[PDB]
Homo-oligomer: A and B are copies of this chain.
């Protein structure tokens, strides 16, 4: 169906196959059938208003890390009682705004945050439902930037301090602790660290209840990685089974905060070839690191597939930006290409456009959705949009 597409839309652009988002979400809803669970899509992976509306129709929840995300979610149709707010740096304005929006709960990451929420809750005359994120100091075995479960990391808190915080929330007349939460990392290929984390948190949860803390939710976060380089992926059945066994004796609603595993595969970066250059061969395309930062930021490798039917040789697929970090794949192996040919960077649905910038003064890309039925979900940015907010200062 590519022909009609390239005739009506200029490259480069993000193209999303919506069914895969629906199917991926649905696989999470059924993984936990014999139990009460809540799947909160992590907006950070991709907050496009349209994909959120799709998830909202499937009654998805939302794991937000900012007021901006909470608003996107509400605007897309996600129910406030299915929204959870995490974040080690929530500002008083975000805290206050969250409380007035009646979301499920604020997942606190510091004792000082807990007190800040109490002070605001009290002034608003409401009892804030809150969850406490614990750092189980477990190595998720992943990229350091994507690793968040070690004492080293700024996320959550130790068992000792957690117990102290829960008790404090219990005593407060403006705090209602109702959930325990953890998230050891992202793009995880090993299910063991996850299970080990669930066991440790389940142990403290059992202890928390024995102390009167009335828990109702057990949040495991997200973290399941995708097959970027054809690696084996943690199966949901094995994931859900491991968690249910870790929760023996605890009658709690399980919450999952998957992001990448919901949208990664459904999104592809369609970019056109501009030139071919040569002892090494460089294939210059019109998309750049400003559009897709994963490769440079995490040395990630996404598959590149030629869409235009067409001698194979090694070559670095590079974008137009002035930096050496602006190269999608080193020594990729592709046939000889010519100006205008089209290629697709695979599995860019997560942390693709959500981390894109306008570096080198390049407008944010057009985003298209496929629904059996091509339509635009984000209009391309005009050149003037780049400096719109700088004109009055000129």
A interface residues with partner B (beta carbon < 8 Å): 43-44, 47-50, 53, 65-69, 71-72, 75-76, 86-91, 109-113, 116, 144-148, 151-155, 157, 161, 274-280, 282, 284-286, 288, 290, 293, 296-297, 316, 318-325, 327, 339, 354-357, 359-364, 367, 369, 375-379, 381, 383, 386-387, 389-394
Cross-chain contact of A318 among B116, B154, B390 (Cβ < 8 A): B154
A113 to B278, CA, bound (A): 12
Residues of B within 8 A of A389 (CB): 364, 378-379, 381
In the complex, the answer to whether B361 meets A110 with C-beta atoms within 8 Å is no
**Pairs A-B, 8 closest by C-beta atoms:** A89-B320, A68-B361, A145-B325, A357-B357, A377-B393, A49-B390, A112-B275, A110-B277
Chain B residues with CB under 8 A of A319: 89
Question: How many copies are assembled?
Answer: 2
Checking B288, B354, B377 against A89 with a beta-carbon cut-off of 8 angstroms, the contacting residue is B288
Bound together, the chains give a CA A116 to CA B90 distance in angstroms of 51
Assembled-state Cα–Cα distance A146/B11 (Å): 27
Interface contact B354-A67, CB-CB below 8 Å: no
A329 to chain B, nearest CB (A): 12
- Chain B, Cβ-Cβ closest to A319: B89
**Would A68 and B323 be within 8 Å (CB), given that A91-B274, A91-B286 are in contact?**
no
